[PDB]
C-alpha cells in the first residue's frame, strides 16, 4: 500500500497520479500529471464520502473511450503533503477520504511515502510549480 519516491519516479518514466492537498497548494506544486481532488469544499467532501460521486469518476469523465477499463487495470497513487505511514492517517484527512473511496471502488491504491515533501527532495524535476 506504500511507494517510495524513486520508485514513482521510475513509474513516471516507464499511473494515475492523486494529490490529495488544498486546492491552494496543489496550484501552488504539485506532481506532473497528478489530479486534484477537492476534500476542502463540503458539497464535494460530503459527496465522495457519502459515494454519491466516485474518485475512479472524476478522473474518468475527463477521458475517452476506453477510459474507465484503463484506468482500473492502471496502478492508483495517492499522496499527501508528508504523510508517511496509511495506517496512521486519521479519518478526518483527505488522504483517508479519497483512499476509502478508491477501495470502495475496488481499488488498491498506494501512499507516497512521505508526500510531496519528500518527493520534491530529488525529483523537484518533476512536478509543475505555478507562476505566482
Same mark, same amino acid.
Given at each position: 500500500? =506504500?511507494?517510495?519516491?524513486?520508485?514513482?519516479? *521510475?513509474?513516471?518514466?516507464?499511473?494515475?497520479?492523486?494529490?490529495? !492537498?488544498?486546492?491552494?497548494?496543489?496550484? @501552488?506544486?504539485?506532481?506532473? %500529471?497528478?489530479?486534484? =481532488?477537492?476534500?476542502?469544499?463540503?458539497?464535494?467532501?460530503? !459527496? /465522495?464520502?457519502?459515494? @454519491?460521486?466516485?474518485? /475512479?469518476?472524476? &478522473? #474518468?469523465? !475527463?477521458? %475517452?473511450?476506453?477510459?474507465?477499463?484503463? &484506468?482500473? #487495470?492502471?496502478? =492508483? &497513487?495517492?499522496?499527501?503533503?508528508?504523510?508517511?505511514?496509511? #495506517?496512521?492517517?486519521?479519518? $478526518?484527512?483527505? +488522504?483517508?477520504?479519497? /483512499?476509502?473511496?478508491?477501495?470502495?471502488? %475496488? *481499488?488498491?491504491? +498506494?501512499?507516497?511515502?512521505? %508526500? +510531496? $515533501?519528500?518527493?520534491?527532495?530529488?525529483?523537484?524535476? /518533476?512536478?509543475?510549480?505555478? @507562476?505566482?
Amino acid at each position: 500500500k =506504500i511507494i517510495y519516491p524513486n520508485d514513482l519516479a *521510475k513509474k513516471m518514466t516507464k499511473p494515475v497520479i492523486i494529490d490529495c !492537498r488544498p486546492f491552494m497548494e496543489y496550484n @501552488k506544486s504539485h506532481i506532473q %500529471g497528478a489530479v486534484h =481532488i477537492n476534500c476542502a469544499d463540503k458539497i464535494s467532501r460530503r !459527496r /465522495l464520502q457519502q459515494g @454519491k460521486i466516485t474518485v /475512479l469518476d472524476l &478522473i #474518468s469523465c !475527463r477521458e %475517452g473511450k476506453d477510459s474507465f477499463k484503463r &484506468i482500473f #487495470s492502471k496502478e =492508483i &497513487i495517492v499522496y499527501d503533503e508528508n504523510t508517511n505511514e496509511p #495506517s496512521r492517517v486519521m479519518p $478526518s484527512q483527505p +488522504l483517508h477520504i479519497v /483512499l476509502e473511496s478508491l477501495k470502495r471502488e %475496488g *481499488k488498491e491504491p +498506494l501512499v507516497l511515502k512521505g %508526500g +510531496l $515533501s519528500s518527493f520534491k527532495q530529488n525529483h523537484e524535476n /518533476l512536478c509543475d510549480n505555478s @507562476k505566482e
